[PDB]
């Protein structure tokens, strides 16, 4: 259409607030203070196309997954209300995290204010994803051990809330603090070792490894570290600046890792639910 006509612009002519990655040389969206232009750009080819769709498609998937999970027969669960509320808080975190991100990337070029407000929701989004992922996992791991289940939930809440407070800070969004962000969110997810070690100390090596806690956790931690390293080190556009502007840049690859990582986590924690079903409720 002949309304809100725009063109992809080189990195150099971007305002300071829109200059995030110096390695993405071309294909940027010019600052357009119209949500109309912003939401149509979802159907255009630019630096954020991949970013929008990865978490736009992932968002509907987790929503349908969340919907279907809730409608699961109450027969398949030992405590259908409890397990459904624990899985619910994970989907609440997954859906919110993804919805915030694809919305942020869509409305990224509106204004300095819109970017500021939406970037804050984007970072806070991830902290809700880490907090939400812990709730079902911590619940199944500390099923017949209620005191640590409760303690560890508070530490994740306080740390997650701290990560939400840290994301509000304006210096936090600067490209120099990219490393700080990567470390902050890595620390939050990597806090998984405290409950794991407690679990391993009590359940046993064989018992923790029998159940795929380790197989699943090494993979979790791998995605967590391989995933943050890409974000912080800006691979592969660090080498190859240009040619990676539209496809397969670090943010795009990282976006794929969030969707992939959240699905794999759901799969691991859905197995714990299935095992508990075979075992039944209570303890020896």
């Amino acid at each position, epitope marked *: 259409e002949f*309304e*809100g006509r725009w063109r992809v612009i080189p990195h150099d002519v971007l305002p300071d607030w829109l200059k995030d990655n110096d390695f993405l040389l071309h294909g940027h969206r*010019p600052p*357009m203070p*119209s949500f109309r232009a912003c939401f149509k750009s979802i159907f255009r080819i630019h630096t954020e196309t991949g970013n929008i769709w990865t978490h736009l498609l992932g968002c509907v998937f987790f929503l349908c997954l969340g919907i279907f999970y809730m409608f699961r027969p109450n027969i398949s669960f030992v405590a259908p209300l409890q397990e459904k509320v624990v899985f619910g808080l994970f989907f609440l975190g997954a859906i919110l995290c993804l919805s915030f991100s694809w919305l942020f990337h869509t409305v990224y070029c509106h204004s300095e204010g819109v970017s500021r407000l939406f970037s804050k929701l984007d970072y806070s989004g991830i902290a809700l994803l880490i907090m939400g992922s812990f709730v079902p996992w911590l619940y199944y791991s500390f099923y017949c051990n209620p005191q640590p289940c409760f303690i560890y939930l508070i530490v994740i809440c306080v740390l997650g809330i701290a990560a939400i407070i840290v994301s509000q800070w304006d210096m936090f969004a600067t490209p120099q603090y990219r490393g700080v962000r990567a470390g902050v969110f890595l620390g939050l997810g990597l806090s998984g070792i405290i409950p794991t070690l407690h679990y391993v100390i009590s359940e046993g090596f064989l018992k923790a490894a029998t159940i795929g806690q380790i197989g699943w956790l090494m993979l979790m931690a791998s995605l967590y570290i391989t995933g943050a390293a890409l974000y912080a080190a800006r691979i592969p556009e660090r080498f190859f600046p240009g040619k990676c502007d539209i496809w397969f840049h670090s943010h795009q690859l990282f976006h794929i890792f969030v969707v992939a990582g959240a699905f794999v986590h759901f799969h691991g924690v859905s197995n714990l639910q299935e095992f508990r079903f075979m075992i039944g409720g209570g303890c020896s």
Partner: single-chain antibody, 238 residues
Framework: MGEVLLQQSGPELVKPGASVRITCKAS????????MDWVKQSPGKSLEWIGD????????IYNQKFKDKATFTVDKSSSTAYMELRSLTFEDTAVYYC???????????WGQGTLVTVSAAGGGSGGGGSDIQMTQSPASLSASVGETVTITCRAS??????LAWYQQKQGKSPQVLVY???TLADGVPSRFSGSGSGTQYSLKINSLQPEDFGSYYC?????????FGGGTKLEINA
């Protein structure tokens, strides 16, 4: 290069019914990266959008006023843009500008201006008005130095904050002050402040200075054809 410069051909004095080919030499950037626009300003009158040309694609979009009168060509090799005006009449006596678009059609860089004078001293039609009407208030004002002035722009339809403010000194090309309704352009003093939403926008100059006199224009770049406001003549008594 060091600076983005748009440089056009020299003044033209033509016989009625002739044809002129105006040149715009673009330097300081990748020529193909941005659209180039052509703007006509008749003597003592506001700016009119002739059309835009995409140097990469080679695609031209024309204002229907100039659909028959103007043609856009390029030379990606010499980094020049051209505009051919044909079957020239007395009405065509105007200064024609090339203005470079950035992402959105607000003009950061302007050509010096080529004057086409149509004269039969050596031996047709009219101009309309379409789609988004830009209304500027006041048409003229005069304020003592240090005073605060507010200029408004009212669009016939919603332009979605795709509004730019220009200042024009006597016999010079307009220079952008504000783009995207509130964003302040590079080198423009903090005195200029752009505010507005929907169809009603305003420009406020605080503690006006002797350099502040000139003509102020507002441009809408939401819909095509892009339109300019009638202008505000600002005189400084001091």
């Amino acid at each position: 290069m060091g600076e983005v410069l748009l440089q056009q051909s020299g003044p033209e004095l033509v016989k009625p019914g002739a044809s002129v080919r105006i040149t715009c030499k673009a330097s300081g950037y990748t020529f193909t990266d941005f659209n180039m626009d052509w703007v006509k300003q008749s003597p003592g009158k506001s700016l009119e959008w002739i059309g835009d040309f995409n140097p990469n694609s080679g695609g031209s979009i024309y204002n229907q006023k100039f659909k028959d009168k103007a043609t856009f060509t390029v030379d990606k090799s010499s980094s020049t843009a051209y505009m051919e005006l044909r079957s020239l009449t007395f009405e065509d006596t105007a200064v024609y500008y090339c203005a470079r678009e950035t992402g959105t059609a607000w003009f950061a860089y302007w050509g010096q201006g080529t004057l086409v004078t149509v004269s039969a001293a050596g031996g047709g039609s009219g101009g309309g008005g379409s789609d988004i009407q830009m209304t500027q208030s006041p048409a003229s004002l005069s304020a003592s130095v240090g005073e605060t002035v507010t200029i408004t722009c009212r669009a016939s339809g919603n332009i979605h904050n795709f509004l730019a403010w220009y200042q024009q000194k006597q016999g010079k090309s307009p220079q952008v002050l504000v783009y995207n309704a509130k964003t302040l352009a590079d080198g423009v003093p903090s005195r200029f402040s752009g505010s507005g939403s929907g169809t009603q926008y305003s420009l406020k100059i605080n503690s006006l200075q002797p350099e502040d006199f000139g003509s102020y224009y507002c441009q809408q770049f939401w819909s095509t054809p892009y339109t300019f406001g009638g202008g505000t003549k600002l005189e400084i008594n001091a």
